Structure formats: structure tokens, C-alpha cells
Amino acid sequence: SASAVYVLDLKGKVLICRNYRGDVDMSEVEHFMPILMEKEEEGMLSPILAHGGVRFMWIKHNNLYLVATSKKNACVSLVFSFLYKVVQVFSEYFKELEEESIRDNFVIIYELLDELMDFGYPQTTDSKILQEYITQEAPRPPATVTNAVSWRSEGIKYRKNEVFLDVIEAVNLLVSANGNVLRSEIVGSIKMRVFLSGMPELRLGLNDKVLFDNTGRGKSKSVELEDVKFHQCVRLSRFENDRTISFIPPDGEFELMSYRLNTHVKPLIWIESVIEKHSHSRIEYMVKAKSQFKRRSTANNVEIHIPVPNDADSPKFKTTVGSVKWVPENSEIVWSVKSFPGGKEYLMRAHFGLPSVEAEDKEGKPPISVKFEIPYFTTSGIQVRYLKIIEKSGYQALPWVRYITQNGDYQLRTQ
Amino acid sequence: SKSSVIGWPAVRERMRRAEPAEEVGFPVTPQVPLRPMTYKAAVDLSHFLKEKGGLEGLIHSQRRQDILDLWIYHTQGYFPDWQNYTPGPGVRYPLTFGWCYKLVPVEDPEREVLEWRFDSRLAFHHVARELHPEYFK
């Protein structure tokens, strides 16, 4: 129940404001900047502010914080969802999120803001559907918004029917400084770029453990996805009944399902690092990386971030494979490896100086983060079984899908 | 299928070597199609196995079945899930329709000795589907 959604700037200037209910005066935005400064300077800064009887709940974007005023006990989750939808719509319409487009695309921005939410209740949020009613360069609204199918515009015709899938894996490992991994979860990401003619009803079928058990094939490699988050086009009832993944794919790239299950296997990369930091004299980095992944897979663009001293200077790197560069902006040693064959072992011996005078305050121990991304590797073992592309007219589809394995929250706790 | 014919003798030898009773990861061949075996493909594979021999009358074993499924997947891209047998005790029918292979007793269903036997009626009669309609949907 937001009262007025406004877009601010980095200097406190409101780039654009659009009141929806008017229950909050527009002058209350002036106290938002001082309130945010006080909260940040006292550690009380939060995404949801409070200017007396009016709360300013908003998030910070690339260049501005979208503050949406509210007065009643409105759904903060609803406000956050509306803000996320607005950010996605702006990103779809404008390739960049900065003040350069706010002051240049106001004509279409105002129309989009007026059409998106009325009286604090959003009604239309599909960027592809919204692009047919509001343009920056007006006919009747499309029937898709009024119709039940608001994610598949009718009348789409293409020369070919090719759908590109992307099974993106995120290897997140929370390894403590003692050497034990605490948070080791892998979240699947099935992003598909459907480009066909018409409104096909996709019939997704994979090697799920639950599906195999129900059908009686619970003996082969089946993915035990703890959480499966279907998209809007996917029918929740069909999945709830017999794990039937039936949905109408949209035109473009979108996320259909997002698997998320815990991981109990060995890490793909094992890093053994040592810290021979002398007391204001020198420092040693005996870092050894062991690739526990399969030898048939190669981790393209391996970036193991090793946090070096903040005041360290005159560093020397004695490694084996991969480019080692120290970034003063990040204050860490970037163990950059182009191609890392599975089972490879890289040994590094760091040596950097340190000032004699001790630092005034402690800087902490940032964790070591690996940026390995090995494509064509399905760690979870989940394989797509079939994709029932059915169209009323009748056509032969050519679906495609690729599996990409990367490291997510794969950080290693420092000692 | 020259590749299938070549792999049939080695596969049969490996199955015979394994008694009736190391690397991590799940690599995927680049551009190799992966899909469940079709009924026609299953019937053709059963006919080829019957013609070549080594599968009819062979003692059923988990290791031999896994090796055969892996070889079939490598040589054809068929998912190793269509080579399932109906639960015992007694004769186990193939789970996938069209398969001509079935398990029959040779003497708890787990300790019962089973042997692979060709069955042409399996490709025409859905014995597994009829026995377990819930498993077939």
C-alpha cells in the first residue's frame, strides 16, 4: 500500500516521483536523505525507513535508491516486489540503469509508471507485453493482459522454431577457517530463450528423483532438488498433481524453473593456503589449489581471489600455472587461471612487504573466493528427459539446451 | 549399426566376465543427443541382442545390467532408465514398452536367480504397464 513511489539520485535529488494515493505529502522526501545519512552513520540504516507516521521502504539501485513512501500498514513485501518489477522493466526498456536515461526518457518513463501501478496496486508487469502498449518512439491494449495467458503474446510468427536452454549451475561452498565446509548448497538455474511461432505449451520432463520414484524408475541417477521454483507460465496445479511441468514458454529469454538442493559431494576445487606473515617484516602465501572435479571437464576462467594485506606493497608471486595479479583497488591477490584441467594442482608462493609502523585499526580477514566456471559439467547429475512442444497448427521444433557449471557462494574462510 | 555391432562382442565379454552376484563427475559428450530409448529403438535393440546372442539366458546381475545400460547409452545416447524390470517375485517384465528382454526365475525376490529371456509379446503386450498402472500413469 505505497503512497508515492519516487526515484532519487546520489545527491538527494528526486529524479522522478509519481504519487499513487496521495496520502503522503511530497515534501517528506526531503527528510529521507538526512534520515538515511543518520541511519548509515549510526548503523541503523535499513531498506525500510520511517519518517514519523510515514515509512520510506526502498532499495538502492545502480545509481539511485527507489524510495516509495507509504503511510498505512502496507505490505512491505508487496512494495519490494513492485520495486523489483519496476527495476526489471527499466532494465528491459533501458539498457543502462543510470541518471543519463532518467533525464532523457521521461516521456516513456512517466507513462510506464502511470500504467504499472494504480492506487498503489500494480496490475501489469510483463516487459514484453508492456512494450506493445507504451512506446518511446497509442493503439488498444493487447488481449494478453486481459486474457489468462499474460506471458505468451498471441500471433507471434517466426521462420524457425528454436528454443535455447541454459542449465546454469551455482556451486556455493561455505568453508570455515578450520577446513570444514558449512554451507555447501547448489542451486539449479534453468533459463530458456524460447523463439518459436505461436503459443506452444511446453511439457518439461527431467530426471527428477521424485518423478522416478513415482513412475517406478527410482534406481538411476535422479536429481533430488529440495526446492523447485517454477515460473509464472508453469502451472502449479500440474506440478502438484503428478510432477507435470506444463507451461506456455514466452517469446525471449526467461527463467522457467530454479532448482535448489543441498550438496554432499567433495568440492570441485580444494585450496590449501598458508599465511607466513611476519610481524611487520614480510608475508608468505603458500597457496595450493587441488581440482577435485572430473578430469574431462575444464574450468574456464578460474579466478581464485586471495585476500592479500591491505597495506602490503612490493609483492612478488611465485606460482606454477595461471596469471597472478594483485589489485590495489580490491586489496587481494587474484589467482587468475584461463583454463584449469580437472585434477590440476597449482602451487603458489606469495611474498609481499609490510610497513614497519602498525596499522591504527584492524581490517579483518576477507574470505578467499574462487571464480571457477567449468562448462559442460552437471555436478548435480540432473539431465533433461524431454520437452513436449505442442502447437495447435503443428510444427517440428528444434529445442536446444546447454549445461554450464560455475561457482556461486564458493568462498573459503580465512584463518 | 557398425558401432553397435562392434560394441556387442566386447559388451557380452564384459558381462560374462562380471560375476552374476573411482572417478567423480558427470561428463556429457558435447553435442551428443540424450533422450530416453524409444519403443521402436528398444524393439530393434532386443532383436539385435537376440540375433547376436549372449543376452538370452544370461544370468541377471546388477553389475551386468548397469554395464549394458552404460554401453547402450554410450553407443546410442539412450538414457539408462528404460532397462527396468517389474518387481518380483516371479517373472519381471520390462518397464519400457517395446523391449523384448525380460527376467524369469532360474531355480525374497532379491535372492531369486533371474535370467534374461527374449519375449516377442513384450513389444506388443504392455505387461509391465498392466501390472503397475500407477507406475505407468
Binding site: 536452454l165 511439457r203 513412475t215 513436449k388 536446444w400 | 540424450l34 519400457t96
Partner: peptide, 18 residues
């Protein structure tokens, strides 16, 4: 080609499950 794994064709359904 494409970085992150070459795209592979997908099936239509579980042919072995009827």
C-alpha cells in the same frame, strides 16, 4: 561453439515411460 558448454538438443518426452 560457445563458452560454458555447447548447446545440446532436447527430447520431447520420456519415450521409455509410455
Amino acid at each position: 561453439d560457445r563458452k560454458g558448454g555447447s548447446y545440446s538438443q532436447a527430447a520431447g518426452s520420456d519415450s521409455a515411460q509410455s
